[PDB]
Amino acid sequence: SLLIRGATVVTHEESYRADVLCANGLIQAIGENLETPSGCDVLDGGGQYLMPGGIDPHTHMQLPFMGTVASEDFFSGTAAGLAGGTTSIIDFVIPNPRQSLLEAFHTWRGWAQKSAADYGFHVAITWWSDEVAREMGELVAQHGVNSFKHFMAYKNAIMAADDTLVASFERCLELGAVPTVHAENGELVFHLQQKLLAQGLTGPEAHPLSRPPQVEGEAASRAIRIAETLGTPLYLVHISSREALDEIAYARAKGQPVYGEVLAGHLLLDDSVYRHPDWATAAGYVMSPPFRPVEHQEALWRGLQSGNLHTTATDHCCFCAEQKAMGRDDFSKIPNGTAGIEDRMALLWDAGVNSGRLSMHEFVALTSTNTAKIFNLFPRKGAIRVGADADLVLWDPQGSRTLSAATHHQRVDFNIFEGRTVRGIPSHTISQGKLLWAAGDLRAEPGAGRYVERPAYPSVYEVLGRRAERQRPVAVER
Amino acid sequence: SLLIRGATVVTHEESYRADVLCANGLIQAIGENLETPSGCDVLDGGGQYLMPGGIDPHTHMQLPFMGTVASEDFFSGTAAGLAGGTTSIIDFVIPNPRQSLLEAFHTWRGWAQKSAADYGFHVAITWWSDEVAREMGELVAQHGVNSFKHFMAYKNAIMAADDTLVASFERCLELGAVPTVHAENGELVFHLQQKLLAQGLTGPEAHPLSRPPQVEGEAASRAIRIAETLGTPLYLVHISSREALDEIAYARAKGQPVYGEVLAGHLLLDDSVYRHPDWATAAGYVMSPPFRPVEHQEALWRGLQSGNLHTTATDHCCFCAEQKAMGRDDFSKIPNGTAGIEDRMALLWDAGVNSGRLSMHEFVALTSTNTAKIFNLFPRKGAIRVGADADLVLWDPQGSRTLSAATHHQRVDFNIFEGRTVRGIPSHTISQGKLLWAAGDLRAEPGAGRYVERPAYPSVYEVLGRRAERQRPVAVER
Ligand SMILES: [Zn+2]
Ligand SMILES: [Zn+2]
């Protein structure tokens, strides 16, 4: 067992000085001057903050994608997360078109077995048929999935057009599952890619131009209004644009349950990174949605402060130089993705909390609690309370770290924040009650993490249910 | 020739006392105490306002549509417009899918030959191919068309999906033509129609429920952002919802050239009309988009006052009780459309000018001049100046009229403003310099109107051209 002693507990709401005891994977007791079981290990947290471990709901460990397989696997990725204070992930099962969802799910379960920390899956709806809708039913009832991902881009691949989105959202409603969406207009992306290639703009600087912010705002508006019509909630993954954020805020003002996810990269980087003279450097930043002109970073910070963006994630999707260089002659063939699972919490703490833009409680809400609530994992996760999973991070407000591809634990040769020094770092990370990161030493073990099931019908479905009752149509009698 | 003496001339900007002389179809002279050519007729405009005749850019005379043919034909419709102060129309050629655009154009020219006043056409893009793209160019270069209509609704009929919108908008840009859009999401409409019928809601009260406002807002957002991406202007036909209006306003706030059209019905009627106990009365109001909850009418008036709505029109699409009753068992089979060409200007003057919501100059801009500008007909139309077409209305601010299906000149048995009394009416209407409406007497003759060609490249394409030059992608040198 493990007792964290002398730290200030910081939750999504409040701060209070307390000791915390963990045993048997759970938080057992919280209070001052706690009694110590015999042989219990002790961690001294004086002058530090003790928070829930981060939850990263958007990772792509060893994703086979755009020709090849991501260089980060489920072990090295979850391990790198632990070093950065992240104690659990939600990844994506991505069936090929025409491929059984259950078959892809079991393949992905095997891959994730080596995870060093708790993990779960969204399942992507990459094609539609009657059997897909049935396989969605087994995934929810039997395999602990409660959210389904829809890609609005990738025309001629996995793009879900309006009819699939409509049919799939209706299925999500019947199952009490959360629809999630990668919001970019796939038709516009395809058109711009071919226009830019025909002009000879083959380099990475054409990648931001091939999917400008209104392509994201359009798809956000469309998924949001399909979700309103069908009566489902909606989770929009990694929002990057003022356009998309303004569509989310518009829907939330109308009482619609719409959630926005954001990456640290889109809070802190602008699209000038794509104009770097060195091809490999520019290609290192290639991901979808791309990094944006500076106006959009300020807008995203406003969404965080106003409560119109709710969760942080990383889109952790690692490709090394040789893999990126598959698109050396054609930016549209660069495998999309950047690393970030190890860096998310420190980047957000340094930019948000140190500056006073965000409270420590907002930081906790944005790194674990809101994700936990949205996907029906609260208070098992994202919570410091008796009976909750003992996933915790000890945070040193005066500690320093310099992000570098040469020193990070992410199995990739590039860092989009290379050279950045942050103040405020995770000194210790606790997962399932065990100390797996301690001041420079990572103790992750392959296979230690558990598969985390997420129950259906998060509490928003209670609100939606009564709304549908109140709005039943009544015929006119004539 | 015809001399209007003693009136106050009211334009889109100013008012001043002047006589106006017309001859040979044109305005020949404007001034105080004009001399009278020999044999010139004289019309006394004392105590009245002399304005450009209304332009109605949205009519559907004798449309074959939803099973049958509209009861108003090009003569009775243009004549009814004259009695109501409207001196020219723009109608729609609507080819069947896979039907030659040129073939449909010539058929519609034959039909429109009987017009009593000037008329022109938008051409609808009801299917796509290389031949459609070729015929669009011939229509612009040889037949005086400069605008192409796209229906985003009517799934499995004439719906233009994203790939058609993209390709057609690209063609409009190449030709200097204005894309226009009927903005409703066809997939959502189809889903809601079939859901409501399976619930047994077959009556007209299900029609608004089958296309609620976010269905229009989504489609507006999508056409607008396709237009931004492709670099074209965009005209959205009859906007009815705050949602769509807010998307227009959002884009215009960023400097995008987006124009909105509105009908008097959507300014003044709410959706309670569809719950009328008499089936035929409820069905009389069935049109798309449908009339909306009251909050939406106030939003549209503000869009007019703020300059985010630009034109008024009527969607003049007449079906009598028998024709409406084709959907007696199935609201989705009710031929959609209402009458308004005769009523538009008095409805707007009485509701807008008498109340102080709109100046007389805004009334002129909203009833002719903005339409003329957008479609490259200014100052030929919508203008009181030497050399402009002599299309004029003499307006009596103290004249009264009560709108009724029993007394109107529109060849249809229903008026959506039945019983409404308005103050401020056209006492005389002048088309091509001849008096065709004179204090109760209609003197319209079939064939008197001319086909009005509209030149390509309205001046907005000049700014767009410089904008695209300045924002051209530039390659990074490596
Ligand atoms: Zn992703
Ligand atoms: Zn229409």
mmCIF file of C-alpha atoms in Angstrom, chain B residues 274-477:
data_model
loop_
_atom_site.group_PDB
_atom_site.id
_atom_site.type_symbol
_atom_site.label_atom_id
_atom_site.label_comp_id
_atom_site.label_asym_id
_atom_site.label_seq_id
_atom_site.Cartn_x
_atom_site.Cartn_y
_atom_site.Cartn_z
ATOM 1 C CA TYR B 274 -49.931 24.866 -39.535
ATOM 2 C CA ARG B 275 -52.163 23.856 -36.594
ATOM 3 C CA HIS B 276 -55.333 25.388 -38.042
ATOM 4 C CA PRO B 277 -58.278 22.967 -37.589
ATOM 5 C CA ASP B 278 -59.355 23.330 -41.216
ATOM 6 C CA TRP B 279 -57.060 21.120 -43.305
ATOM 7 C CA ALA B 280 -57.133 23.324 -46.421
ATOM 8 C CA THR B 281 -56.322 26.454 -44.433
ATOM 9 C CA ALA B 282 -53.297 24.808 -42.797
ATOM 10 C CA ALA B 283 -52.150 23.410 -46.155
ATOM 11 C CA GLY B 284 -52.418 26.868 -47.755
ATOM 12 C CA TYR B 285 -49.335 27.842 -45.706
ATOM 13 C CA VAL B 286 -47.237 24.799 -46.651
ATOM 14 C CA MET B 287 -43.997 26.016 -48.266
ATOM 15 C CA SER B 288 -40.276 25.416 -47.691
ATOM 16 C CA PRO B 289 -38.840 26.754 -45.563
ATOM 17 C CA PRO B 290 -41.976 26.655 -43.392
ATOM 18 C CA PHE B 291 -43.129 29.479 -41.165
ATOM 19 C CA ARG B 292 -41.307 29.543 -37.819
ATOM 20 C CA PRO B 293 -41.839 30.270 -34.091
ATOM 21 C CA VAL B 294 -42.270 33.960 -33.315
ATOM 22 C CA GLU B 295 -38.693 34.575 -32.075
ATOM 23 C CA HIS B 296 -37.541 34.067 -35.680
ATOM 24 C CA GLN B 297 -39.621 36.907 -37.159
ATOM 25 C CA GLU B 298 -37.956 39.444 -34.849
ATOM 26 C CA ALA B 299 -34.552 38.063 -35.836
ATOM 27 C CA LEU B 300 -35.308 38.600 -39.540
ATOM 28 C CA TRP B 301 -36.450 42.219 -39.026
ATOM 29 C CA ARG B 302 -33.168 42.897 -37.255
ATOM 30 C CA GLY B 303 -31.267 41.313 -40.144
ATOM 31 C CA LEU B 304 -33.010 43.749 -42.465
ATOM 32 C CA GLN B 305 -32.200 46.685 -40.191
ATOM 33 C CA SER B 306 -28.577 45.608 -39.697
ATOM 34 C CA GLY B 307 -27.791 44.965 -43.359
ATOM 35 C CA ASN B 308 -27.445 41.197 -43.018
ATOM 36 C CA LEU B 309 -30.561 40.575 -45.137
ATOM 37 C CA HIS B 310 -30.517 42.319 -48.505
ATOM 38 C CA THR B 311 -33.510 41.510 -50.741
ATOM 39 C CA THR B 312 -37.206 40.771 -50.529
ATOM 40 C CA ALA B 313 -38.970 38.223 -52.726
ATOM 41 C CA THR B 314 -42.081 36.061 -52.631
ATOM 42 C CA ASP B 315 -41.310 32.459 -53.684
ATOM 43 C CA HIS B 316 -44.472 32.997 -55.762
ATOM 44 C CA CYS B 317 -45.646 29.408 -56.237
ATOM 45 C CA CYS B 318 -49.426 29.057 -56.469
ATOM 46 C CA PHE B 319 -51.487 25.914 -55.870
ATOM 47 C CA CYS B 320 -55.250 25.839 -55.310
ATOM 48 C CA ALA B 321 -57.181 23.696 -52.800
ATOM 49 C CA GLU B 322 -57.393 20.708 -55.179
ATOM 50 C CA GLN B 323 -53.690 20.829 -55.814
ATOM 51 C CA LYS B 324 -52.821 21.242 -52.125
ATOM 52 C CA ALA B 325 -55.143 18.308 -51.373
ATOM 53 C CA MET B 326 -52.838 15.963 -53.307
ATOM 54 C CA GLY B 327 -51.259 15.618 -49.843
ATOM 55 C CA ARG B 328 -54.487 15.108 -47.888
ATOM 56 C CA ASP B 329 -53.124 11.816 -46.508
ATOM 57 C CA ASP B 330 -49.401 12.701 -46.531
ATOM 58 C CA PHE B 331 -48.092 16.202 -45.782
ATOM 59 C CA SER B 332 -44.888 15.436 -47.702
ATOM 60 C CA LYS B 333 -46.975 15.282 -50.907
ATOM 61 C CA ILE B 334 -48.600 18.723 -50.508
ATOM 62 C CA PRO B 335 -47.214 20.901 -53.345
ATOM 63 C CA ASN B 336 -45.140 23.521 -51.532
ATOM 64 C CA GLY B 337 -45.664 27.243 -52.106
ATOM 65 C CA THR B 338 -47.662 30.400 -51.353
ATOM 66 C CA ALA B 339 -48.628 33.502 -53.325
ATOM 67 C CA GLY B 340 -47.111 36.925 -52.716
ATOM 68 C CA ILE B 341 -45.976 38.836 -55.808
ATOM 69 C CA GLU B 342 -48.905 41.261 -55.653
ATOM 70 C CA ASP B 343 -48.644 41.652 -51.896
ATOM 71 C CA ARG B 344 -44.885 41.952 -51.162
ATOM 72 C CA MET B 345 -44.406 45.719 -51.375
ATOM 73 C CA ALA B 346 -47.548 46.780 -49.473
ATOM 74 C CA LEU B 347 -46.849 44.175 -46.792
ATOM 75 C CA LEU B 348 -43.303 45.481 -46.314
ATOM 76 C CA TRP B 349 -44.313 49.154 -46.486
ATOM 77 C CA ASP B 350 -47.148 48.728 -43.986
ATOM 78 C CA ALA B 351 -45.136 46.575 -41.557
ATOM 79 C CA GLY B 352 -41.720 48.188 -42.103
ATOM 80 C CA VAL B 353 -42.140 51.857 -43.064
ATOM 81 C CA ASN B 354 -45.304 52.771 -41.133
ATOM 82 C CA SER B 355 -43.754 51.332 -37.936
ATOM 83 C CA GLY B 356 -40.377 53.065 -38.190
ATOM 84 C CA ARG B 357 -38.428 49.816 -38.489
ATOM 85 C CA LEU B 358 -37.286 50.786 -42.010
ATOM 86 C CA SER B 359 -36.713 54.065 -43.769
ATOM 87 C CA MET B 360 -38.345 54.652 -47.134
ATOM 88 C CA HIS B 361 -34.855 54.421 -48.610
ATOM 89 C CA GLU B 362 -34.271 51.030 -47.008
ATOM 90 C CA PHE B 363 -37.668 50.040 -48.395
ATOM 91 C CA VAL B 364 -36.434 50.889 -51.908
ATOM 92 C CA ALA B 365 -33.080 49.136 -51.412
ATOM 93 C CA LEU B 366 -34.888 46.038 -50.106
ATOM 94 C CA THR B 367 -37.567 45.959 -52.841
ATOM 95 C CA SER B 368 -35.471 46.633 -55.985
ATOM 96 C CA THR B 369 -32.039 48.230 -55.765
ATOM 97 C CA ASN B 370 -30.158 45.532 -53.833
ATOM 98 C CA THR B 371 -31.529 42.792 -56.095
ATOM 99 C CA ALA B 372 -30.487 44.902 -59.080
ATOM 100 C CA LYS B 373 -26.980 45.391 -57.677
ATOM 101 C CA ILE B 374 -26.424 41.759 -56.706
ATOM 102 C CA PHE B 375 -27.456 40.390 -60.112
ATOM 103 C CA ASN B 376 -25.679 43.091 -62.184
ATOM 104 C CA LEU B 377 -28.811 44.995 -63.265
ATOM 105 C CA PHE B 378 -28.014 48.313 -61.509
ATOM 106 C CA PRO B 379 -28.568 51.052 -62.627
ATOM 107 C CA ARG B 380 -30.589 49.629 -65.521
ATOM 108 C CA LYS B 381 -33.145 48.616 -62.854
ATOM 109 C CA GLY B 382 -33.827 49.759 -59.308
ATOM 110 C CA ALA B 383 -32.763 53.332 -60.081
ATOM 111 C CA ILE B 384 -34.400 56.660 -60.844
ATOM 112 C CA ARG B 385 -31.909 58.247 -63.235
ATOM 113 C CA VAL B 386 -31.692 59.291 -66.881
ATOM 114 C CA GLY B 387 -31.187 56.253 -69.101
ATOM 115 C CA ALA B 388 -32.567 53.721 -66.612
ATOM 116 C CA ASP B 389 -35.514 51.517 -67.518
ATOM 117 C CA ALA B 390 -38.782 53.334 -66.778
ATOM 118 C CA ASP B 391 -40.021 50.833 -64.180
ATOM 119 C CA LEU B 392 -41.723 52.916 -61.508
ATOM 120 C CA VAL B 393 -44.377 52.760 -58.820
ATOM 121 C CA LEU B 394 -46.373 55.727 -57.549
ATOM 122 C CA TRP B 395 -47.037 55.121 -53.873
ATOM 123 C CA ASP B 396 -49.961 56.514 -51.921
ATOM 124 C CA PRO B 397 -49.014 56.580 -48.212
ATOM 125 C CA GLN B 398 -52.651 57.041 -47.140
ATOM 126 C CA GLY B 399 -54.246 54.542 -49.512
ATOM 127 C CA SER B 400 -55.717 51.464 -47.910
ATOM 128 C CA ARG B 401 -56.151 47.890 -49.103
ATOM 129 C CA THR B 402 -57.422 44.675 -47.512
ATOM 130 C CA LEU B 403 -55.714 41.573 -48.894
ATOM 131 C CA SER B 404 -58.145 38.827 -49.889
ATOM 132 C CA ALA B 405 -58.173 35.749 -52.099
ATOM 133 C CA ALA B 406 -61.608 36.952 -53.250
ATOM 134 C CA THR B 407 -60.213 40.274 -54.570
ATOM 135 C CA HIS B 408 -56.537 39.814 -55.374
ATOM 136 C CA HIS B 409 -55.342 39.388 -58.952
ATOM 137 C CA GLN B 410 -53.165 36.366 -58.195
ATOM 138 C CA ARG B 411 -54.782 33.344 -59.867
ATOM 139 C CA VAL B 412 -54.986 31.263 -56.684
ATOM 140 C CA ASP B 413 -57.735 30.620 -54.141
ATOM 141 C CA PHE B 414 -55.719 31.331 -50.982
ATOM 142 C CA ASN B 415 -53.907 34.321 -49.489
ATOM 143 C CA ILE B 416 -51.622 33.770 -46.527
ATOM 144 C CA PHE B 417 -52.511 37.302 -45.342
ATOM 145 C CA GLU B 418 -56.291 36.921 -45.843
ATOM 146 C CA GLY B 419 -58.058 39.766 -44.030
ATOM 147 C CA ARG B 420 -54.987 41.906 -43.370
ATOM 148 C CA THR B 421 -55.519 45.643 -43.939
ATOM 149 C CA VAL B 422 -52.439 47.614 -44.977
ATOM 150 C CA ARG B 423 -51.999 51.363 -45.296
ATOM 151 C CA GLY B 424 -49.694 52.546 -48.073
ATOM 152 C CA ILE B 425 -50.357 51.019 -51.506
ATOM 153 C CA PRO B 426 -49.284 51.375 -55.148
ATOM 154 C CA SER B 427 -51.745 53.687 -56.887
ATOM 155 C CA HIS B 428 -49.993 53.476 -60.270
ATOM 156 C CA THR B 429 -47.379 51.126 -61.712
ATOM 157 C CA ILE B 430 -45.255 51.982 -64.743
ATOM 158 C CA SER B 431 -43.340 49.366 -66.757
ATOM 159 C CA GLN B 432 -41.230 50.280 -69.815
ATOM 160 C CA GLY B 433 -42.616 53.810 -69.432
ATOM 161 C CA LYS B 434 -46.254 52.766 -69.861
ATOM 162 C CA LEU B 435 -48.954 52.933 -67.224
ATOM 163 C CA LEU B 436 -50.082 49.331 -66.635
ATOM 164 C CA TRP B 437 -51.825 49.792 -63.254
ATOM 165 C CA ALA B 438 -53.908 52.854 -62.493
ATOM 166 C CA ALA B 439 -56.092 53.102 -59.363
ATOM 167 C CA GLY B 440 -57.862 49.778 -59.623
ATOM 168 C CA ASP B 441 -57.511 49.268 -63.381
ATOM 169 C CA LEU B 442 -55.072 46.624 -64.629
ATOM 170 C CA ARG B 443 -53.927 47.157 -68.224
ATOM 171 C CA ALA B 444 -51.403 44.343 -68.512
ATOM 172 C CA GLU B 445 -51.171 42.657 -71.917
ATOM 173 C CA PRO B 446 -49.589 39.239 -72.610
ATOM 174 C CA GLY B 447 -46.187 39.489 -74.247
ATOM 175 C CA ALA B 448 -45.483 43.112 -73.321
ATOM 176 C CA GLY B 449 -42.552 42.208 -71.073
ATOM 177 C CA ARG B 450 -39.024 41.696 -72.364
ATOM 178 C CA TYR B 451 -36.546 38.998 -71.451
ATOM 179 C CA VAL B 452 -33.878 40.722 -69.338
ATOM 180 C CA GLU B 453 -30.292 39.570 -69.809
ATOM 181 C CA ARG B 454 -27.897 40.018 -66.882
ATOM 182 C CA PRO B 455 -24.176 40.459 -67.693
ATOM 183 C CA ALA B 456 -21.624 38.232 -66.047
ATOM 184 C CA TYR B 457 -19.030 39.477 -63.496
ATOM 185 C CA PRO B 458 -20.880 41.774 -61.091
ATOM 186 C CA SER B 459 -18.321 44.023 -59.507
ATOM 187 C CA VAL B 460 -17.858 41.835 -56.410
ATOM 188 C CA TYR B 461 -15.721 39.567 -58.608
ATOM 189 C CA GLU B 462 -13.235 42.455 -58.905
ATOM 190 C CA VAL B 463 -12.506 42.438 -55.143
ATOM 191 C CA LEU B 464 -12.521 38.656 -55.086
ATOM 192 C CA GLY B 465 -9.953 38.626 -57.890
ATOM 193 C CA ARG B 466 -7.589 40.964 -56.010
ATOM 194 C CA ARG B 467 -8.203 39.067 -52.771
ATOM 195 C CA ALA B 468 -7.237 35.730 -54.358
ATOM 196 C CA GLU B 469 -4.089 37.303 -55.890
ATOM 197 C CA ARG B 470 -3.028 38.662 -52.486
ATOM 198 C CA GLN B 471 -3.840 35.419 -50.644
ATOM 199 C CA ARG B 472 -2.311 33.097 -53.276
ATOM 200 C CA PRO B 473 -0.361 30.164 -51.809
ATOM 201 C CA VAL B 474 3.412 30.697 -52.069
ATOM 202 C CA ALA B 475 5.867 27.795 -51.931
ATOM 203 C CA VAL B 476 8.653 27.554 -49.368
ATOM 204 C CA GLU B 477 12.077 27.209 -50.949
#
